[PDB]
């Protein structure tokens, strides 16, 4: 689909109704696999962190580490398709502008590329923006070809505010996910038993981020 049709006819109404929106086959197999290739290249060349310290043993050789991070601006050599992805996310958001909540999105973060190494680690339940830091939408792109969560785990489980039920999102290849970043969407990553990659950017609301800057401060000489 074109960004505009998908945004107007699916993403906006879905986000406003549920605060979670799943878009399958966002870029298609060729581009998706190119992104996968770049992400794996970054991994294989050591551009990721060693991963979140999960268990700190008395000894450190047996330390267990979870999700590995790298921040990608999108102009880096070898990250050209990632930059293409980020631009396509941005086009999708731009063609929603004004219609997602009352938010006026005026910026985003760089891309946080995560790699769960497949050793059983996941990510604890949390809220992305609990303190009013300006992030209003979480956007995640999944690159894991033929992911079977029944075997490999790694479901993102969201606990939408004031609902008994979970929303389980499998980290399926070429899948794009949006959710409100605030307390309406606590979530966790269930233990991943295979290598799981995802690419996250957060979009800022202009007003929230403007007054976050006020409360959190940016110093000029007298
Ligand atoms: C380090 C860090 C990771 C995440 N990632 C996820 O919630 C997982 C989404 C997915 O991969 O499905 N969120 C925050 C607020 C921080 Br900080
Ligand atoms: Fe999160």
Author numbering: 188 to 404, 410 to 414
Task: Show sentences the authors wrote.
The degradation of HIFα subunits is promoted by post-translational hydroxylation of prolyl-residues located in its N/C-terminal oxygen dependent degradation domains (NODD and CODD). These dioxygen-sensitive reactions are catalysed by 2-oxoglutarate (2OG) and Fe(II) dependent prolyl hydroxylases (PHD 1–3 in humans). The human PHDs catalyse hydroxylation of prolyl-residues within the N/C terminal ODDs of HIF-1/2/3α and are negative regulators of the transcriptionally regulated hypoxic response.
Following from the observation that specific heteroaromatic inhibitors with glycine side chains induce PHD2 crystallization in the P63 form, we investigated the selectivity of small-molecule induced PHD2 crystallization. We employed 96-well screens for crystallizing PHD2 constructs (PHD2181-426 and PHD2181-407, hereafter nPHD2 and cPHD2, respectively) with a set of cyclic 2OG analogues and related small-molecules. We observed that crystallization of nPHD2 is induced by succinamic acid derivatives (SCAs), 4a, 4b, 7f. and 30a. This is interesting because none of these SCAs are potent PHD2 inhibitors or stabilizers (as observed by MS, NMR and thermal shift analyses) in solution. The nPHD2.SCA complex structures manifest a similar ligand binding mode to that observed in the reported nPHD2.FG2216/P63 structures, i.e. like FG2216 and related compounds, the SCAs coordinate the active site metal ion via their heteroaromatic ring nitrogen and side chain amide carbonyl oxygen. However, while the bidentate coordination of the active site metal ion by SCAs forms an approximately planar six-membered chelate ring, more established PHD inhibitors, including FG2216, form a five-membered chelate ring. The chelate ring size may affect the stability of the protein-complex and possibly its binding/inhibition potential. Although biophysical (MS, NMR) analyses suggest that SCAs form only a weak complex with monomeric nPHD2, the clear Fo-Fc difference density for the SCAs suggests that intermolecular interactions of SCAs notably with the C-terminus of a threefold symmetry related neighbour in the P63 form may both stabilize the ligand binding in the crystal lattice and help promote crystallization. Unexpectedly, the work with small molecule ligands led to the observation that the ability to induce formation of the homotrimeic crystal form does not correlate with either their active site ligand binding efficiency or inhibitory potency. Compounds from both the FG2216 and SCA series enable nPHD2 crystallization with approximately equal efficiency, yet FG2216 (and related compounds) are significantly more potent inhibitors than the SCAs under the tested assay conditions.
